[PDB]
Amino acid sequence: VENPSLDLEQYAASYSGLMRIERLQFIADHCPTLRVEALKMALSFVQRTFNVDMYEEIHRKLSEATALDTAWVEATRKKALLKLEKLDTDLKNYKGNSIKESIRRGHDDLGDHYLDCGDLSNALKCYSRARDYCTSAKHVINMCLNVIKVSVYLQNWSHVLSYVSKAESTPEIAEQRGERDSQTQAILTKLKCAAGLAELAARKYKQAAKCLLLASFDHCDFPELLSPSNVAIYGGLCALATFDRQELQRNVISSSSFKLFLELEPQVRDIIFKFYESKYASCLKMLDEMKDNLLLDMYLAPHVRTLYTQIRNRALIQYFSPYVSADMHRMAAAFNTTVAALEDELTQLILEGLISARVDSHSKILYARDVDQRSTTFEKSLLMGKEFQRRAKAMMLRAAVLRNQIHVK
Amino acid sequence: LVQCILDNTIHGRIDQVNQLLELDHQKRGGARYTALDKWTNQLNSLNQAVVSKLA
Amino acid sequence: HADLCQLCLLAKCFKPALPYLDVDMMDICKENGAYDAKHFLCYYYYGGMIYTGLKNFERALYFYEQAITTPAMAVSHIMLESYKKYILVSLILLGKVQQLPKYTSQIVGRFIKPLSNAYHELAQVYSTNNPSELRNLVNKHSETFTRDNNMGLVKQCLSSLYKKNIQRLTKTFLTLSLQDMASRVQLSGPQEAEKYVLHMIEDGEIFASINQKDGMVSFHDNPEKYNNPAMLHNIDQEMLKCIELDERLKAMDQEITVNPQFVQKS
């Protein structure tokens, strides 16, 4: 009930743009006994950034699901339309001026207006029109980052993947082996983080962890795409669920760059350290404790549950990696479950071939079966020979019936 | 022992019921069996390829 | 051959036709151009029914598949019945409907399948390993099976589901209680499970032993080491069959080479 880990003021001040609006909307949508507080802060604190339509949507959903000072909103709408028309006229003037700097600044103002207004269709049309006008690599980089951001907002990951692949393949295969590591070019960390978010949201956890672990704290000081806390959360959870022991050791525990992210969110660091050092009761207990906070998240919640199961399964397999005979009672105690539920889970794991073992339910012991390579080779060869003989004797009959030109009319 | 086995440092397994460590002084020249398995798989694939050509 | 198989089927005397079904047909008598495809289809269908009557499900499946894969451009009732019985036999002998060979007519395989939809959904619910749903759906299309006289094969599928569940229990367990097995495979009683496992071991379909002191079943999945002269003889017989198959193939190849139309076209 009591938790001092959440610094609400710093968390709110750390976000810029529409990110925090979506964050509070998502938490307040499915949070019990906290919706009133979130709505109170939304009404009292965030009044700027042109909150009109989603206020009406909230009113409509609260009314049907469970005069007015229209002059100001109409004046602001007309002012926005007039500003857009003025910017369009200025852009036409810049086009007629035949100055590259003029058209570049016009495009910059148009992009800023589209960012602060929310219109995306005309933004896509303008980007399609201006894609053919590329002269310098830096401008292409900025426009690619902008289109990546708008595709992330649109929740369309195919364009994200295509643009990322284009950006990587353009400079002679990512500058061959690799140049001097990032000194002040924080763009590569930003694009890696965007690609990680896109891959995570595309039900691809392994690649998301692979391309998200390559981040630097000194170059992750942009709290507008993905905060350090949830970046560490994702990089820990995906690595725990999908990475094997060797690469988890060589990419998380051995990685000194990720140590800062791990201490930023101590829970994930403790989870990974306990999982690595064959500790599962405490690890799974803390995973269950943190699951409630993970479900309140935005970009991880729909992908949390499956990830969790994966982690558990991995733990299960690891628990039987050094054993040829294991006690089911100790295993159940280590996995915070009863012997019957553990037996069912291990039965399911053995059925799909993840664990090569056999359960003895009399003494409740999980033995390890050893496949006899000689016997299985012999039986597979004999079965293949039998199948070959059947197939050949069917093919001979088919040849006989085709030679006779026998068919049904 | 669990940490060393998980690290591929110790080639062995643990009897929890008997409190034992059984080492891996095994795995003789069974490459013949893997070669025969590959031969069987290639033969099965060639079977399906040849038989289903026309007739 | 078709008439002999039909007479053996109608007279309920399957033994006489056995020597004329165990051999594999190679080349077909032309009968002066009076050998219709109906004779081939009905011969293979009746051989399949004879084999299903004698519990030889592997050869019955082979016969049904041979009947189905006859090239055609129309719909035949023999072919449709062969398809239904092939689905049933593949559900009995194996745990799934065996995939038909690729060299089948592409047009006859789009019209017969919708007609036999009850059997396809029977396989679909069979793959869920739930006997209760299988029985409910059998009662739902009892009329279709009774009209097609496929009853008895459906009950055999019902029993084979229980047998397959018991067999799958050995892929996970070394030793299991009678009550646990009965609850897992839904036989509703330790005694019924014990009788089922006893019959399964008696037929050789499973390696297990029953201990009535604790009411337990232990699966000993270590049958053979492949180090005895009996396996030597078995491999010898398989090699002899393969060698005779190759000799027949070479004879057919030489016959097709000596044919005057060959070489002239090549």
XYZ file of C-alpha atoms in Angstrom:
730
model
C 0.000 0.000 0.000
C 2.933 2.290 0.818
C 5.689 2.835 -1.747
C 8.104 5.807 -1.763
C 9.818 4.710 -5.001
C 7.568 6.868 -7.206
C 8.679 10.500 -7.491
C 5.574 11.908 -9.168
C 6.897 15.453 -9.635
C 10.172 14.411 -11.282
C 8.395 11.742 -13.344
C 5.916 14.315 -14.660
C 8.588 16.957 -15.313
C 10.787 14.422 -17.141
C 8.298 14.005 -20.013
C 7.656 16.332 -22.946
C 5.136 16.355 -25.778
C 2.249 13.892 -26.009
C 4.111 11.051 -24.267
C 2.948 11.845 -20.740
C -0.642 12.392 -21.909
C -0.766 8.879 -23.364
C 0.998 7.510 -20.274
C -1.558 8.907 -17.816
C -4.446 7.966 -20.115
C -3.187 4.379 -20.289
C -2.660 4.003 -16.535
C -5.955 5.683 -15.599
C -7.840 3.514 -18.109
C -7.263 0.308 -16.115
C -6.106 1.325 -12.628
C -8.399 0.843 -9.596
C -8.782 3.493 -6.864
C -6.391 5.870 -8.678
C -8.408 7.082 -11.691
C -9.841 10.035 -9.755
C -6.355 11.199 -8.732
C -4.966 10.902 -12.271
C -7.947 12.790 -13.702
C -7.567 15.470 -11.019
C -3.916 16.026 -11.928
C -4.766 15.977 -15.647
C -7.437 18.645 -15.133
C -5.413 20.840 -12.772
C -1.818 20.660 -14.044
C -1.729 19.966 -17.802
C -3.933 22.636 -19.375
C -1.588 23.596 -22.237
C -0.655 21.506 -25.315
C -4.157 21.907 -26.787
C -6.275 19.406 -24.842
C -9.762 19.674 -26.352
C -10.717 16.538 -28.294
C -9.571 13.899 -25.806
C -11.357 15.812 -23.035
C -14.595 15.373 -24.985
C -13.740 11.709 -25.578
C -13.203 11.191 -21.833
C -16.520 12.916 -21.127
C -18.317 10.756 -23.701
C -16.875 7.485 -22.405
C -17.571 8.308 -18.752
C -21.123 9.366 -19.644
C -22.085 6.388 -21.805
C -19.866 3.557 -20.469
C -19.396 3.981 -16.689
C -24.052 28.028 -23.406
C -20.544 26.595 -23.164
C -17.440 28.749 -23.687
C -17.050 27.510 -27.264
C -15.785 30.964 -28.300
C -12.249 30.275 -27.061
C -11.937 26.873 -28.751
C -13.370 28.216 -32.016
C -10.991 31.187 -31.901
C -8.023 28.883 -31.293
C -9.111 26.586 -34.138
C -9.438 29.535 -36.526
C -6.081 30.901 -35.346
C -4.448 27.526 -36.007
C -5.992 27.441 -39.488
C -4.784 30.986 -40.203
C -1.287 30.150 -38.941
C -1.201 27.056 -41.158
C -2.282 29.126 -44.168
C 0.349 31.773 -43.383
C 3.048 29.105 -43.084
C 1.916 27.601 -46.397
C 2.130 31.023 -48.060
C 5.597 31.547 -46.573
C 6.635 28.113 -47.860
C 5.420 29.046 -51.348
C 7.385 32.301 -51.101
C 10.490 30.337 -50.088
C 9.950 27.970 -53.025
C 9.775 30.964 -55.357
C 12.837 32.511 -53.701
C 15.050 29.643 -54.970
C 16.951 29.492 -51.662
C 17.731 26.101 -50.136
C 17.944 27.586 -46.635
C 14.533 29.231 -47.065
C 12.822 25.998 -48.117
C 14.644 24.093 -45.362
C 13.420 26.529 -42.704
C 9.919 26.374 -44.177
C 9.992 22.586 -43.920
C 11.238 22.886 -40.329
C 8.356 25.187 -39.366
C 5.896 22.896 -41.165
C 7.209 19.905 -39.224
C 7.024 21.804 -35.936
C 3.433 22.831 -36.708
C 2.503 19.238 -37.556
C 4.119 18.083 -34.305
C 2.209 20.599 -32.181
C -1.079 20.234 -34.111
C -1.427 16.462 -34.475
C -2.365 16.317 -38.155
C -0.625 13.346 -39.776
C -2.142 12.776 -43.233
C -0.916 16.099 -44.622
C 2.389 15.438 -42.847
C 2.683 12.130 -44.710
C 1.843 13.857 -48.000
C 4.479 16.542 -47.383
C 7.083 13.919 -46.455
C 6.303 11.930 -49.607
C 6.640 15.099 -51.691
C 9.915 16.157 -50.040
C 11.557 12.704 -49.962
C 12.900 13.280 -53.488
C 14.746 16.436 -52.320
C 17.848 15.171 -50.501
C 21.256 16.859 -50.694
C 23.120 16.285 -47.409
C 23.304 13.188 -45.229
C 22.597 15.143 -42.033
C 19.250 16.473 -43.283
C 18.283 12.958 -44.372
C 19.178 11.815 -40.848
C 16.943 14.427 -39.207
C 14.040 13.704 -41.556
C 14.437 9.947 -41.039
C 14.348 10.463 -37.270
C 11.216 12.600 -37.641
C 9.476 10.009 -39.823
C 10.510 7.304 -37.338
C 8.898 9.322 -34.542
C 5.684 9.865 -36.504
C 5.555 6.165 -37.436
C 5.993 5.268 -33.758
C 3.107 7.616 -32.962
C 1.052 6.008 -35.751
C 1.927 2.530 -34.378
C 3.043 1.368 -37.834
C 6.213 -0.688 -37.437
C 6.750 -1.790 -41.052
C 7.751 1.753 -42.019
C 10.002 1.911 -38.943
C 11.780 -1.280 -40.005
C 12.091 -0.142 -43.627
C 13.545 3.252 -42.695
C 15.927 1.696 -40.155
C 17.162 -0.801 -42.750
C 17.599 1.990 -45.307
C 19.568 4.102 -42.823
C 21.837 1.188 -41.900
C 22.421 0.059 -45.497
C 23.016 3.525 -46.989
C 26.574 4.226 -45.661
C 28.491 1.261 -47.145
C 27.052 -1.383 -44.795
C 27.058 0.642 -41.553
C 30.592 1.969 -42.121
C 32.005 -1.548 -42.583
C 33.305 -3.103 -39.360
C 32.733 0.003 -37.243
C 34.194 3.444 -36.574
C 35.334 4.945 -33.259
C 32.615 4.430 -30.659
C 30.058 7.118 -29.871
C 31.762 10.217 -28.458
C 29.056 12.867 -28.917
C 26.862 11.355 -31.687
C 23.800 10.403 -29.646
C 21.785 9.712 -32.817
C 22.806 6.046 -32.979
C 21.547 5.339 -29.453
C 18.272 7.093 -30.305
C 17.706 5.038 -33.455
C 18.693 1.832 -31.645
C 16.169 2.626 -28.901
C 13.460 3.351 -31.479
C 14.222 0.072 -33.264
C 14.128 -1.757 -29.936
C 10.714 -0.312 -29.133
C 9.459 -1.232 -32.611
C 10.755 -4.810 -32.381
C 9.400 -5.258 -28.850
C 5.983 -4.024 -29.980
C 6.211 -6.457 -32.929
C 6.328 -9.560 -30.674
C 10.089 -9.917 -31.288
C 11.729 -9.806 -27.858
C 15.154 -11.264 -28.693
C 16.061 -8.705 -31.358
C 14.599 -5.925 -29.203
C 16.920 -6.926 -26.361
C 19.864 -7.306 -28.752
C 19.444 -3.832 -30.266
C 18.370 -2.180 -26.989
C 21.264 -3.359 -24.800
C 23.645 -1.264 -26.944
C 22.762 2.004 -25.220
C 24.808 4.499 -23.213
C 23.604 6.505 -20.223
C 25.619 9.554 -21.299
C 23.804 9.432 -24.664
C 20.340 8.456 -23.393
C 19.473 11.898 -21.997
C 16.422 12.389 -24.232
C 13.368 11.689 -22.008
C 10.903 11.944 -24.902
C 11.085 8.456 -26.480
C 11.817 5.949 -23.694
C 12.749 6.742 -20.099
C 15.827 5.089 -18.541
C 13.684 3.207 -16.005
C 11.515 1.386 -18.535
C 14.472 1.042 -20.924
C 16.256 -0.919 -18.195
C 13.031 -2.812 -17.444
C 12.680 -3.899 -21.080
C 16.364 -4.726 -21.512
C 16.280 -6.873 -18.397
C 12.981 -8.658 -18.983
C 13.574 -9.467 -22.659
C 17.132 -10.642 -21.978
C 15.974 -12.833 -19.090
C 13.179 -14.343 -21.186
C 15.012 -14.918 -24.482
C 18.786 -14.910 -23.922
C 20.612 -18.106 -23.030
C 22.970 -18.263 -20.059
C 26.187 -17.561 -21.975
C 24.955 -14.508 -23.881
C 23.013 -13.219 -20.868
C 26.275 -13.378 -18.913
C 28.271 -11.738 -21.705
C 25.662 -9.050 -22.491
C 24.090 -8.069 -19.147
C 26.198 -9.022 -16.124
C 29.532 -8.590 -17.919
C 28.375 -5.431 -19.710
C 29.527 -2.412 -17.704
C 27.477 0.080 -19.734
C 24.222 -1.630 -18.728
C 25.272 -1.524 -15.059
C 24.076 2.085 -14.792
C 20.672 1.126 -16.202
C 20.544 -1.828 -13.805
C 21.221 0.318 -10.730
C 18.692 2.847 -12.033
C 16.024 0.133 -11.598
C 17.370 -2.092 -8.792
C 14.489 -4.578 -9.046
C 15.457 -5.739 -12.545
C 19.131 -5.976 -11.573
C 18.242 -8.118 -8.553
C 15.950 -10.267 -10.714
C 18.685 -10.916 -13.279
C 21.368 -11.552 -10.652
C 19.181 -14.005 -8.725
C 18.099 -15.813 -11.900
C 21.724 -16.111 -13.021
C 22.886 -17.467 -9.647
C 20.366 -20.349 -9.613
C 17.979 -18.558 -7.224
C 14.338 -18.875 -8.250
C 12.126 -18.562 -5.161
C 13.234 -14.986 -4.472
C 13.503 -14.186 -8.186
C 9.986 -15.388 -8.988
C 8.562 -13.769 -5.842
C 10.046 -10.405 -6.824
C 8.874 -10.928 -10.413
C 5.328 -11.446 -9.128
C 5.641 -8.381 -6.888
C 6.820 -6.197 -9.792
C 4.250 -7.643 -12.235
C 1.558 -5.288 -10.915
C 3.688 -2.243 -11.729
C 4.657 -3.788 -15.076
C 0.999 -4.193 -16.055
C 0.347 -0.488 -15.433
C 2.980 0.284 -18.089
C 2.110 1.245 -21.671
C 4.519 -0.392 -24.136
C 5.186 -3.563 -22.105
C 1.892 -4.645 -20.507
C 0.354 -6.562 -23.472
C 3.694 -8.368 -23.810
C 4.321 -8.894 -20.083
C 2.427 -12.109 -19.353
C 3.948 -14.227 -22.125
C 7.410 -12.899 -21.279
C 6.867 -13.946 -17.670
C 5.942 -17.487 -18.678
C 9.016 -17.653 -20.905
C 11.194 -16.584 -17.985
C 9.635 -19.215 -15.745
C 10.120 -21.912 -18.370
C 13.756 -20.904 -18.779
C 14.210 -21.141 -15.019
C 12.560 -24.564 -15.057
C 14.956 -25.826 -17.714
C 17.950 -24.355 -15.913
C 16.864 -25.988 -12.663
C 17.175 -29.379 -14.352
C 20.315 -28.588 -16.359
C 22.820 -29.862 -13.723
C 20.625 -32.723 -12.442
C 20.049 -36.287 -13.543
C 17.676 -36.918 -10.608
C 15.911 -34.064 -8.821
C 13.514 -33.870 -5.888
C 10.093 -32.524 -6.849
C 9.473 -31.097 -3.366
C 12.615 -28.947 -3.414
C 11.902 -27.939 -7.020
C 8.363 -26.874 -6.095
C 9.672 -24.936 -3.093
C 12.210 -23.219 -5.359
C 9.445 -22.310 -7.835
C 6.838 -21.196 -5.251
C 4.233 -23.785 -6.211
C 2.690 -27.030 -5.020
C 4.022 -30.410 -6.127
C 0.947 -31.123 -8.273
C 1.135 -27.857 -10.226
C 4.878 -28.317 -10.721
C 4.253 -31.869 -11.936
C 1.689 -30.618 -14.461
C 4.013 -27.852 -15.671
C 6.935 -30.262 -16.043
C 4.671 -32.705 -17.889
C 3.800 -29.941 -20.350
C 7.480 -28.999 -20.693
C 8.531 -32.611 -21.336
C 5.727 -33.094 -23.870
C 7.047 -30.289 -26.095
C 10.639 -31.525 -25.788
C 12.012 -28.562 -23.836
C 13.082 -30.854 -20.967
C 14.278 -34.432 -21.532
C 13.096 -35.961 -18.262
C 10.587 -38.378 -16.739
C 8.384 -37.813 -13.692
C 8.078 -40.544 -11.055
C 4.874 -39.709 -9.179
C 5.255 -42.490 -6.601
C 8.344 -41.054 -4.891
C 7.892 -37.644 -6.597
C 11.278 -37.553 -8.323
C 12.120 -35.973 -11.683
C 14.610 -38.299 -13.368
C 16.565 -37.469 -16.516
C 16.115 -39.811 -19.461
C 19.130 -40.534 -21.664
C 18.337 -41.198 -25.316
C 20.202 -44.261 -26.570
C 21.760 -42.942 -29.771
C 22.387 -46.437 -31.151
C 18.841 -47.687 -30.535
C 17.183 -44.512 -31.814
C 19.400 -44.520 -34.916
C 18.468 -48.144 -35.607
C 14.742 -47.556 -35.129
C 14.757 -44.396 -37.262
C 16.614 -46.202 -40.054
C 14.208 -49.153 -39.936
C 11.178 -46.845 -40.019
C 12.683 -44.938 -42.952
C 13.255 -48.206 -44.799
C 9.669 -49.314 -44.197
C 8.374 -45.952 -45.430
C 10.640 -46.217 -48.479
C 9.315 -49.668 -49.335
C 5.700 -48.535 -48.969
C 6.315 -45.421 -51.083
C 8.095 -47.401 -53.805
C 5.420 -50.096 -53.965
C 2.787 -47.359 -54.255
C 4.781 -45.593 -56.985
C 5.087 -48.841 -58.947
C 1.307 -49.270 -58.862
C 0.844 -45.644 -59.919
C 3.194 -46.218 -62.854
C 1.203 -49.333 -63.751
C -2.107 -47.448 -63.719
C -0.683 -44.511 -65.697
C 0.862 -46.803 -68.316
C -2.588 -48.340 -68.815
C -4.022 -44.790 -69.062
C -6.583 -45.693 -66.408
C -8.685 -42.803 -65.108
C -12.252 -42.045 -64.062
C -14.406 -40.280 -66.648
C 28.553 -27.734 -8.453
C 25.388 -26.336 -10.052
C 27.196 -23.111 -10.957
C 30.157 -25.007 -12.429
C 27.953 -27.371 -14.453
C 25.873 -24.468 -15.778
C 29.138 -22.830 -16.895
C 30.234 -25.960 -18.834
C 33.231 -26.085 -16.483
C 32.299 -29.451 -14.920
C 31.038 -32.276 -17.146
C 28.685 -34.041 -14.771
C 25.251 -34.241 -13.200
C 23.900 -34.378 -9.652
C 21.850 -37.038 -7.880
C 19.740 -34.963 -5.508
C 17.965 -38.063 -4.184
C 21.251 -39.849 -3.387
C 23.477 -36.765 -2.878
C 25.896 -37.778 -5.619
C 27.882 -36.241 -8.455
C 28.092 -38.513 -11.502
C 30.781 -37.341 -13.905
C 30.626 -37.629 -17.685
C 33.315 -40.217 -18.435
C 31.170 -41.254 -21.416
C 30.434 -40.116 -24.991
C 32.678 -42.445 -26.971
C 32.951 -42.426 -30.765
C 29.247 -42.025 -31.533
C 29.877 -39.789 -34.549
C 29.097 -42.891 -36.607
C 25.520 -42.827 -35.313
C 25.097 -39.128 -36.126
C 26.494 -39.784 -39.608
C 24.017 -42.642 -40.052
C 21.174 -40.387 -38.879
C 22.172 -37.747 -41.433
C 22.321 -40.481 -44.082
C 18.822 -41.634 -43.104
C 17.421 -38.092 -43.240
C 18.996 -37.409 -46.639
C 17.660 -40.751 -47.871
C 14.138 -39.872 -46.708
C 14.318 -36.499 -48.453
C 15.623 -38.125 -51.646
C 12.783 -40.656 -51.393
C 10.150 -37.934 -51.291
C 11.905 -36.070 -54.113
C 12.291 -39.023 -56.495
C 8.982 -40.799 -55.873
C 6.838 -37.670 -56.290
C 8.431 -36.477 -59.549
C 5.684 -37.592 -61.929
C 4.726 -41.170 -61.055
C -9.704 -59.566 -58.063
C -12.404 -56.967 -57.406
C -15.163 -59.575 -57.683
C -13.320 -61.945 -55.339
C -12.849 -59.147 -52.802
C -16.525 -58.182 -53.076
C -17.640 -61.789 -52.576
C -15.357 -62.170 -49.558
C -16.723 -58.915 -48.124
C -20.383 -59.824 -48.658
C -19.983 -63.407 -47.400
C -17.984 -62.328 -44.305
C -15.172 -64.713 -45.314
C -12.015 -62.599 -45.413
C -9.446 -65.405 -45.130
C -9.598 -66.690 -48.764
C -8.825 -63.241 -50.210
C -5.726 -62.787 -48.027
C -3.179 -64.367 -50.445
C -4.620 -62.173 -53.231
C -4.333 -58.998 -51.132
C -0.940 -59.492 -49.460
C 0.891 -59.334 -52.804
C 1.578 -55.949 -54.390
C 0.074 -55.368 -57.829
C 2.522 -54.627 -60.646
C 1.063 -54.029 -64.130
C -2.654 -54.463 -64.886
C -4.221 -56.848 -67.386
C -5.802 -54.864 -70.211
C -8.717 -57.307 -70.690
C -8.980 -56.096 -74.305
C -9.685 -52.566 -73.112
C -12.594 -53.619 -70.881
C -10.781 -52.978 -67.574
C -12.518 -49.895 -66.189
C -11.190 -47.702 -63.396
C -14.247 -48.805 -61.410
C -12.692 -52.265 -61.085
C -9.469 -50.781 -59.690
C -11.257 -48.442 -57.275
C -13.662 -51.079 -55.978
C -10.932 -53.724 -55.669
C -8.802 -51.438 -53.517
C -11.811 -50.258 -51.497
C -12.933 -53.835 -50.809
C -9.387 -54.852 -49.907
C -9.278 -51.969 -47.451
C -12.575 -53.033 -45.889
C -11.365 -56.642 -45.676
C -8.176 -55.505 -43.942
C -10.082 -53.275 -41.510
C -12.230 -56.304 -40.728
C -9.029 -58.209 -39.910
C -7.527 -55.324 -37.864
C -4.678 -54.868 -40.383
C -4.911 -51.093 -40.336
C -1.556 -50.311 -41.983
C -2.320 -52.289 -45.139
C -5.919 -51.048 -45.017
C -4.631 -47.465 -44.993
C -2.343 -48.330 -47.904
C -5.278 -49.773 -49.867
C -7.512 -46.775 -49.132
C -4.757 -44.360 -50.168
C -4.212 -46.315 -53.391
C -7.946 -46.120 -54.101
C -8.026 -42.367 -53.427
C -4.989 -41.442 -55.544
C -6.503 -42.838 -58.752
C -6.523 -40.054 -61.380
C -10.031 -38.799 -62.053
C -12.079 -35.865 -63.293
C -15.464 -36.620 -61.655
C -16.809 -37.679 -58.251
C -17.135 -41.387 -57.444
C -18.989 -42.850 -54.473
C -16.316 -45.538 -54.086
C -13.688 -42.787 -53.884
C -15.694 -40.845 -51.287
C -16.255 -43.917 -49.106
C -12.551 -44.710 -49.457
C -11.748 -41.171 -48.293
C -13.986 -41.509 -45.231
C -12.602 -44.914 -44.270
C -9.052 -43.683 -44.924
C -9.611 -40.830 -42.470
C -10.999 -43.266 -39.900
C -8.146 -45.759 -40.356
C -5.520 -43.016 -40.105
C -7.198 -41.868 -36.886
C -7.131 -45.440 -35.548
C -3.676 -46.702 -36.544
C -1.986 -43.301 -36.263
C -2.922 -40.327 -34.118
C -3.666 -38.095 -37.108
C -4.954 -38.100 -40.677
C -2.001 -39.061 -42.865
C -1.260 -36.548 -45.608
C -2.295 -37.796 -49.035
C 0.458 -38.256 -51.649
C 1.212 -35.272 -53.857
C 0.544 -37.103 -57.142
C -3.249 -36.921 -56.859
C -5.684 -35.292 -59.260
C -6.102 -31.632 -58.344
C -9.777 -31.423 -59.347
C -11.206 -34.486 -57.563
C -9.545 -33.274 -54.356
C -11.655 -30.114 -54.047
C -15.133 -31.668 -54.309
C -14.791 -34.848 -52.226
C -13.380 -33.024 -49.187
C -16.437 -30.775 -48.533
C -18.729 -33.811 -48.783
C -16.780 -35.609 -46.026
C -16.823 -32.763 -43.513
C -18.106 -34.723 -40.510
C -15.053 -36.994 -40.624
C -12.718 -34.009 -40.988
C -14.193 -32.329 -37.924
C -14.005 -35.710 -36.172
C -10.257 -35.669 -36.833
C -10.108 -32.029 -35.701
C -11.720 -32.846 -32.350
C -9.670 -36.058 -32.118
C -6.477 -33.992 -32.289
C -7.552 -32.186 -29.090
C -7.128 -35.441 -27.091
C -10.499 -34.946 -25.354
C -12.694 -38.088 -25.399
C -15.751 -36.224 -24.073
C -15.921 -33.821 -27.019
C -15.259 -36.714 -29.405
C -18.223 -38.632 -27.975
C -20.464 -35.553 -28.064
C -19.636 -34.921 -31.722
C -20.091 -38.618 -32.538
C -23.579 -38.388 -31.047
C -24.108 -35.168 -33.017
C -23.457 -36.877 -36.388
C -24.486 -40.398 -35.411
C -26.889 -40.334 -38.372
C -24.092 -39.715 -40.890
C -21.993 -42.602 -39.571
C -24.946 -45.003 -39.327
C -26.122 -44.173 -42.857
C -22.605 -44.715 -44.238
C -22.224 -47.890 -42.113
C -19.023 -46.471 -40.603
C -20.156 -47.307 -37.063
C -17.740 -49.652 -35.342
C -14.872 -47.729 -36.881
C -15.964 -44.635 -34.940
C -16.056 -46.628 -31.696
C -12.603 -47.932 -32.603
C -11.457 -44.313 -32.952
C -12.985 -43.601 -29.536
C -11.025 -46.456 -27.953
C -7.858 -45.526 -29.857
C -8.055 -42.031 -28.366
C -7.876 -43.543 -24.872
C -5.067 -45.869 -25.958
C -3.124 -42.951 -27.457
C -3.594 -40.904 -24.281
C -2.266 -43.813 -22.209
C 0.681 -44.151 -24.602
C 1.390 -40.411 -24.342
C 1.399 -40.777 -20.553
C 4.578 -42.851 -20.974
C 6.312 -40.034 -22.872
C 6.356 -38.023 -19.629
C 6.022 -40.461 -16.724
C 8.182 -43.310 -15.479
C 5.674 -44.286 -12.780
C 2.107 -43.115 -12.201
C -0.786 -43.875 -9.881
C -3.924 -45.583 -11.156
C -6.087 -42.705 -9.910
C -3.784 -40.120 -11.495
C -3.820 -41.949 -14.834
C -7.606 -42.328 -14.721
C -8.030 -38.619 -13.984
C -5.562 -37.615 -16.709
C -6.983 -39.743 -19.539
C -10.584 -39.570 -18.226
C -11.495 -43.216 -17.703
C -13.299 -42.383 -14.412
C -11.970 -45.230 -12.312
C -8.688 -46.895 -11.358
C -10.029 -50.344 -12.282
C -10.932 -49.287 -15.826
C -7.481 -47.737 -16.253
C -5.846 -50.915 -14.939
C -7.824 -53.059 -17.385
C -6.961 -50.697 -20.250
C -3.242 -50.812 -19.451
C -3.340 -54.594 -19.012
C -4.904 -54.984 -22.456
C -2.386 -52.526 -23.922
C 0.562 -54.514 -22.546
C -1.061 -57.773 -23.667
C -1.218 -56.543 -27.273
C 2.371 -55.276 -27.108
C 1.389 -51.657 -27.786
C 3.029 -50.492 -24.538
C 5.809 -51.497 -22.141
C 4.492 -51.269 -18.587
C 3.873 -53.218 -15.395
C 1.151 -53.008 -12.747
C 1.893 -53.076 -9.009
C -1.336 -53.658 -7.081
C 0.359 -53.141 -3.701
C 0.443 -49.386 -4.352
C -1.927 -49.300 -7.336
C 0.839 -48.036 -9.605
C 1.907 -48.421 -13.248
C 5.585 -48.320 -14.228
C 6.598 -47.778 -17.861
C 9.802 -49.597 -18.870
C 10.664 -47.846 -22.136
C 13.819 -49.904 -22.738
C 12.614 -52.692 -25.043
C 15.524 -53.583 -27.323
C 19.279 -53.005 -27.583
C 19.603 -54.076 -31.261
C 22.417 -56.511 -30.421
C 20.844 -59.931 -31.026
C 20.567 -62.300 -34.010
C 16.800 -61.710 -34.160
C 17.381 -58.111 -35.241
C 20.027 -59.411 -37.642
C 17.364 -61.618 -39.238
C 14.863 -58.743 -39.293
C 17.340 -56.474 -41.088
C 18.133 -59.371 -43.437
C 14.449 -59.697 -44.351
C 14.127 -55.941 -44.880
C 17.237 -55.979 -47.081
C 15.851 -58.903 -49.089
C 12.588 -57.031 -49.662
C 14.516 -53.930 -50.749
C 16.749 -55.982 -53.065
C 13.759 -57.639 -54.731
C 12.164 -54.193 -55.079
C 15.301 -52.919 -56.815
C 15.386 -56.005 -59.046
C 11.787 -55.366 -60.105
C 12.629 -51.711 -60.776
C 15.620 -52.721 -62.909
C 13.515 -55.253 -64.825
C 10.884 -52.588 -65.513
C 13.619 -50.161 -66.580
C 15.114 -52.667 -69.026
C 11.641 -53.461 -70.375
C 10.923 -49.762 -70.929
C 14.325 -49.356 -72.603
C 13.805 -52.282 -74.993
C 10.425 -50.835 -76.000
C 10.577 -49.614 -79.631
C 8.830 -46.303 -78.890
C 11.646 -45.473 -76.475
C 14.885 -44.033 -77.930
C 12.850 -42.996 -80.975
C 11.143 -40.362 -78.818
C 14.460 -39.681 -77.051
